[PDB]
């Protein structure tokens, strides 16, 4: 009854962070392939 709250905390923390990380990777690859043209 306390480990699940820890997991939910971990999730609410990382979900947006992991999302921003993936989106930044996508933005970088997009800028790269735009430079390639």
């Amino acid at each position: 009854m306390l480990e699940l709250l820890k997991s939910l905390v971990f999730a609410v923390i990382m979900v947006p962070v992991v999302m921003a990380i993936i989106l930044g990777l996508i933005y970088g690859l997009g800028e790269v392939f735009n430079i390639f043209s």
Binding site: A11, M14, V18, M19, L23, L25, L29, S37
Partner: protein, 1033 residues
């Protein structure tokens, strides 16, 4: 189908309920175990010839059996060991899939027909047939705090008051006892025998004649006289129970009227059958019960029942006698399974959160949370059907199937919401349209993932027995997922969702979620523009594709292989070996040093030390021993330095600087059946009757020529014992006849005195027990004692052994071994870093081709499989690729479009090869399965992108570039949703230190990296491949 359940949602809810109830009943009726039956079925014939050496035993017992081991079906091989303790072990190994009962029976039957050729001593001791391919579920120990009860007394108490209960427990399949119950030991004295002109033969005969049974009949029995009114069963002399009774036995009566009794000449006691093995628990004498689990059992409830019975019986024990649990791997299993269950639930919570984050609808999140558990429970029911269990491999297949389940749900819900938003349609018609789009895609996905996973079930041996679990688990999960996406999720999206119209829901709402919609729209537009700029010149990116293929091939070649990763099961094993000619004293000194070390310099981590003397796996002799080191719980020892690998290295460092010995510490292998990662097992055989000497010469020569190739081989060594000194007693028959001595009496005296003789049975309080006559330690300990033993001639005079028996020293093998009926020597070795098993295994053949004549070779263990069934992965994966291409051609109705998908296999693969390379892993089973999972996910995303593009091009004529851009725009959202959910549900498996950390990390790394790379690359290269294929054809 979906248009049949949207109008009929109660039907779908009913099917879901039925599946849920099935899975619920299954999880109750499912056996739980650490690993399934992986190792091939084997059977061990164990025999014993007390007082014999290796050659006597190999001649009178082993060869005889092996010659009558004919006519047994499905036999892969057999290997025999014959030790100087009289012990024999003939291990037969059958083809996988064989029934371990019918084979045991064929063996027991051939042996039961062969027995009359063995000497009476073996028929009298007992030749047993057991199943070998099992392991101790548990090992219970019993000790006394006070030094009153010794090893044998504890063993007797165990055999009497504890074994029968542990056997009547539920799940307990086999119960072996370490130590032997009481036995009447008769230690004789040669001086006091010659005093009365006696011999051990007289003792033997008297004991045989004065302890036996007698049938004496009845009174008034049939046929009776006419008039009998009474019948009674007669009871004549029966067996003896006490020790005094054995003391009151008459051996002789002198001319002076005196009486000769045992208690005067032979010290009688109540000891054990064998002292060869001595067990200690933290220095305290102990006894043990090894417990192998039964078929279809629950290890957890079984261990609980055992602890409950032993607790019930504790209060009825003597004073100071108590119980302990050295080897209990049940907690490791409990934790490893609880962790996977927690991971499965976290993978649902994360799906909920992700959906609420992108789709602000709660009614949308509710759907996957209902669809995924249904599929997991249906998978449990499917397993229960096919006869599978809840094990490590199955649950790790489930935690990899969750990603496919999540995708199968999220694609549907996302597309339905997308339609409802764009076209302002309501839920029912929006679902109709989305399913019209996605039906064939889901079906082709199902077929593709089947083609990707099924080919693994059809490997050979233990490798295939492992892969079958993952394969069937994931295929069942995916099939139920597809059925669910076609049956239930549409009805749920129709009856639960709410209506929205003409709005991307990103400009009318404020807060974190409005801002997130804004940012996601910006990023989607940027990705669209980038892809649009890409599609104007493609070769610039096909070249990068080729570069990535080359890089991943390089990483694949430079990645080391493996079978399974070692773990921290809460226990490990120390092996003690001594030089040729050691004893119990020195081995126990070394073991006590080991214990003092562990209990002092590892007190912070180690709890107990169970030392068994005279029991090594390389040899069951007297100069060897082991220590089962038990650790505290993973909670009371955090940190790598306090784990089993660091403990092992430190112990080896502290034990290599030791004297006159060889001590090693090692970790309990994953599956007790030792399947190494890159090692082999090479048997060097005598095909010409050369002998032990020439065969040893060839072994030494081969090891020498192998030490000269360290670039491919290393740690090459024999897995046997080297010759030791042996005492030869040459008898002369001329003198034995002159003095009137019977060679039979000579050898009977020698044996019964120095090795031991089992005479007859007696009855203790209840149970029945043996009677062993023997010399006394101080009279059978050196050659100077030989002349202290006398025999009786025919004329009556007594004669000393020294009159007719010369003596010498020689060298002889303590442990002989054979492979398939012919002498052999076992050799071990590893492939040197950077090289594989095939290269070393071929080099050893090249070497053995240069050995003396008559010497040959063969392969055993993993080397057998690896050679017979170790080159069929390419064929089955070619089958897989072909079936996938054909299914994709059917789905897209084209022979070229499928390539657009089958070119994303590398994109994810490399992401798994990088991570596993960085974190320092190998190419093990879990990695091999995460690879296929990531490949399936990538192919899923690509298939939907391609089908969306093609549907737009065909039914709307949008064009190539426009349709492709629209497809990727519509497909971003669900791709990221699935990737994020899966990455999060897996990350704990990567950041893990404790139970199951090895398998957790191996499963999680290669899929985290895989999805990370397949998400941010496939979205770019798939449009490229599609436009390429469509412009070419």
């Amino acid at each position: 189908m979906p248009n049949f359940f949207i109008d009929r949602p109660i039907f779908a809810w009913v099917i879901a309920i039925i599946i849920m109830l099935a899975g619920g009943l299954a999880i109750l009726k499912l056996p739980v175990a650490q690993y399934p039956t992986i190792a091939p079925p084997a059977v061990t014939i164990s025999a014993s010839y007390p007082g014999a050496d290796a050659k006597t035993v190999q001649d009178t017992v082993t060869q005889v059996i092996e010659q009558n081991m004919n006519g047994i079906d499905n036999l892969m091989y057999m290997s025999s060991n014959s030790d100087s303790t009289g012990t024999v072990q003939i291990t037969l190994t059958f083809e996988s899939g064989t029934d371990a009962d019918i084979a045991q029976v064929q063996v027991q039957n051939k042996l039961q027909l062969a027995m009359p050729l063995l000497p009476q001593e073996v028929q009298q001791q007992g030749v047993s047939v057991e199943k070998s391919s099992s392991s101790f579920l548990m090992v219970v120990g019993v000790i006394n705090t006070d030094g009153t009860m010794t090893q044998e007394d504890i063993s007797d108490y165990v055999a009497a008051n504890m074994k029968d209960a542990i056997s009547r427990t539920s799940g307990v399949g086999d119960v072996q006892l370490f130590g032997s119950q009481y036995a009447m030991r008769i230690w004789m004295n040669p001086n006091e025998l010659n005093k009365f002109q006696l011999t051990p033969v007289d003792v033997i005969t008297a004991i045989k004649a004065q302890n036996a049974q007698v049938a004496a009949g009845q009174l008034g029995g049939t046929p009776p006289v006419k008039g009998q009114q009474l019948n009674a069963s007669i009871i004549a002399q029966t067996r003896l129970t006490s020790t005094e009774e054995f003391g009151k036995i008459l051996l002789k009566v002198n001319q002076d009227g005196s009486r000769v009794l045992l208690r005067d000449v032979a010290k009688i006691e109540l000891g054990g059958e064998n002292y060869d093995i001595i067990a200690e628990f933290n220095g305290q004498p102990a006894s043990g019960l090894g417990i192998k689990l039964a078929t279809g059992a629950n290890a957890l409830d079984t261990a609980a029942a055992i602890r409950a019975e032993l607790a019930k019986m504790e209060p009825f024990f003597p004073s100071g006698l108590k119980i302990v649990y050295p080897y209990d791997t049940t907690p490791f299993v409990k934790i490893s399974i609880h962790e996977v269950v927690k991971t499965l639930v976290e993978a649902i919570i994360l799906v909920f959160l992700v959906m609420y984050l992108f789709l602000q609808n709660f009614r949308a999140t509710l759907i996957p949370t209902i669809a995924v558990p249904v599929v997991l429970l249906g998978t449990f029911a499917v397993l229960a059907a096919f006869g599978f269990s809840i094990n490590t491999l199955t649950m790790f297949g489930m935690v990899l199937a969750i990603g496919l389940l999540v995708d199968d749900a999220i694609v549907v819900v996302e597309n339905v919401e997308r339609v409802m938003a764009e076209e302002g349609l309501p839920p029912k018609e929006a679902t109709r349209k989305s399913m019209g789009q996605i039906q064939g895609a889901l079906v082709g996905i199902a077929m593709v993932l089947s083609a990707v996973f099924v080919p693994m079930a059809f490997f050979g041996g233990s490798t295939g027995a492992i892969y079958r679990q993952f394969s069937i688990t994931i295929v069942s999960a995916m099939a139920l997922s597809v059925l669910v996406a076609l049956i239930l999720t549409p009805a749920l999206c129709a009856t639960m969702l709410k209506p929205i119209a003409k709005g991307d829901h990103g400009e009318g709402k404020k807060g974190f979620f409005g801002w997130f919609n804004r940012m996601f729209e910006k990023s989607t537009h940027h990705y669209t523009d980038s892809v649009g700029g890409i599609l104007r010149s493609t070769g610039r990116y096909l070249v990068l594709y080729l570069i990535i293929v080359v890089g991943m091939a390089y990483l694949f070649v430079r990645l080391p292989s493996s079978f399974l990763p070692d773990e921290d099961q809460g226990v490990f094993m120390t092996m003690v070996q001594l030089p040729a000619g050691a004893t119990q004293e020195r081995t126990q000194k070394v073991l006590n040093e080991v214990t003092h070390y562990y209990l002092t310099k590892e007190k912070n981590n180690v709890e107990s030390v169970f030392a068994v003397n005279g029991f090594g796996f390389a040899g069951r002799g007297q100069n060897t021993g082991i220590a089962f080191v038990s650790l505290k719980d993973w909670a009371d020892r955090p940190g790598e330095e306090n784990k089993v690998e660091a403990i092992t290295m430190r112990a080896t460092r502290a034990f290599s600087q030791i004297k006159d010995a060889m001590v090693f510490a090692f970790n309990l292998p994953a599956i007790v059946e030792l399947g190494t990662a890159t090692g082999f097992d090479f048997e060097l055989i005598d095909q010409a009757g050369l002998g032990h000497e020439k065969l040893t010469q060839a072994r030494n020569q081969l090891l020498a020529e192998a030490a000269k190739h360290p670039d491919m081989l290393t740690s090459v060594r024999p897995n046997g014992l080297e010759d030791t000194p042996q005492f030869k007693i040459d008898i002369d028959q001329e003198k034995a006849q002159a003095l009137g001595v019977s060679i039979n009496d000579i050898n009977t005296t020698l044996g019964a005195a120095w090795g031991g003789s089992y005479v007859n049975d007696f009855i203790d309080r209840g149970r029945v027990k043996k009677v062993y006559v023997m010399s006394e330690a101080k009279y059978r300990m050196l050659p100077d004692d030989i002349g202290d033993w006398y025999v009786r001639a025919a004329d009556g005079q007594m004669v000393p052994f020294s009159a007719f028996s010369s003596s010498r020293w020689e060298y002889g093998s303590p442990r002989l071994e054979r492979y398939n009926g012919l002498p052999s020597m076992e050799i071990l070795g590893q492939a040197a870093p950077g090289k594989s098993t095939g290269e070393a295994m071929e080099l050893m053949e090249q070497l053995a081709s240069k050995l003396p004549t008559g010497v040959g070779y063969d392969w055993t263990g993993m080397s057998y499989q690896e050679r017979l069934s170790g080159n069929q992965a390419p064929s089955l994966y070619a089958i897989s690729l072909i079936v996938v291409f054909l299914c994709l051609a059917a789905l897209y109705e084209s022979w070229s479009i499928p390539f657009s998908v089958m070119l994303v296999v590398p994109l994810g693969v490399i992401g798994a090869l990088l991570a596993a390379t960085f974190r320092g892993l190998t190419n093990d089973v879990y990695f091999q399965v995460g690879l296929l999972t990531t490949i399936g996910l990538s192919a899923k995303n690509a298939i939907l992108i391609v089908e969306f593009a093609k549907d737009l091009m065909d039914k709307e004529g949008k064009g190539l570039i426009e349709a492709t851009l629209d497809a990727v725009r519509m497909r971003l959202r669900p791709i990221l949703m699935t990737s994020l959910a899966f990455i999060l549900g897996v990350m704990p498996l990567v950041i893990s230190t404790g139970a199951g950390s090895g398998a957790q990390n191996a499963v999680g790394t290669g899929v985290m990296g895989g999805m990370v790379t397949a998400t941010v690359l496939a979205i770019f290269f798939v449009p490229v491949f599609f436009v390429v294929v469509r412009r070419r054809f």
